[PDB]
């Protein structure tokens, strides 16, 4: 699946406020950078599909496919999480409780302003390509 490297940070706190003292490994985000003078050593070792830059409309759809295949995977993962976070398994974290709550009632919705604006610029974004 889509799973690159993962990293933590060395932190020493109590736990939160009202829980016993602990370590609580905190996560730091990661990336795989790539400088010059190694990509030529990288590109010459690939030589199998090589996936050239900006694609002719077929690579972009696959980018939206496995861009979304990573979305429902996180949805299924968090679905298995909520089905075991209360079903009687482990002490629920007070942190993660409001950390999930400010996602659902903070997503935008549809209105009249979104409607009249969308067909305004979709007409504009289309007719040139037309």
């Amino acid at each position: 699946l889509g799973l690159p490297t993962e990293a933590y940070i060395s932190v020493e706190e109590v736990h939160d406020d009202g829980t016993p003292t602990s370590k609580t490994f905190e996560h730091v985000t990661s990336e795989i950078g790539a400088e010059e003078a190694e990509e030529v050593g990288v590109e010459h070792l690939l030589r199998d599909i090589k996936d050239t830059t900006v694609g002719t409309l077929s690579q972009r759809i696959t980018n939206q496919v496995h861009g979304l295949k990573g979305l429902n995977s996180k949805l299924l993962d968090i679905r298995s999480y909520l089905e075991k976070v209360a079903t009687g398994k482990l002490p629920i974290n007070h942190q993660i409780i409001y950390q999930l709550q400010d996602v659902f009632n903070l997503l935008p919705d549809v209105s009249l302003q979104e409607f009249v604006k969308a067909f305004y610029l979709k007409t504009n974004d289309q007719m040139v390509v037309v």
Partner: protein, 140 residues
């Protein structure tokens, strides 16, 4: 000359010159090969007046349009417009209270899903012009 004399009297609101031209040029109208002009034009002459008025006036009464259309009957003016709205001459409505005849209200068509549907006609047609013109030429 005869058809230009024909479309002159039609687009104008005249009848006696129209019948005179019809009486003069009927021999050609039979020699051309259409006879249905005798029945299909008298609908046109009576609806040319109501289409021009409905295009011009945003809100004309029935008692005014009856005297404007030399009709001498303020009772069938509701019936003419009811034939005009039914036949698709103009989209209006009759307020049958004192004789209010309204017209269109809104002019916004742009952000209301008009242009994309015509544009989908333009893309699908011209790529079919394209691919047919592709296959028609690489014969060798």
């Amino acid at each position: 000359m005869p058809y230009f004399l024909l479309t002159q009297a039609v687009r104008t609101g005249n009848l006696a010159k129209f019948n005179q031209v019809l009486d003069q040029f009927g021999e050609k109208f039979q020699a051309d090969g259409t006879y249905t002009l005798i029945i299909r034009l008298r609908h046109n002459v009576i609806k040319t007046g109501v289409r021009m008025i409905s295009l011009s006036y945003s809100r004309i009464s029935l008692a005014d349009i009856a005297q404007k259309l030399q009709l001498d009957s303020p009772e069938d003016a509701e019936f003419i417009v009811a034939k005009a709205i039914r036949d698709g001459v103009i989209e209006a409505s009759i307020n049958h209270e004192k004789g209010y005849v309204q017209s269109k209200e809104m002019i916004d068509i742009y952000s209301t899903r008009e242009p994309q549907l015509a544009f989908h006609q333009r893309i699908s047609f011209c790529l079919d012009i394209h691919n047919m013109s592709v296959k028609a030429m690489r014969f060798p």
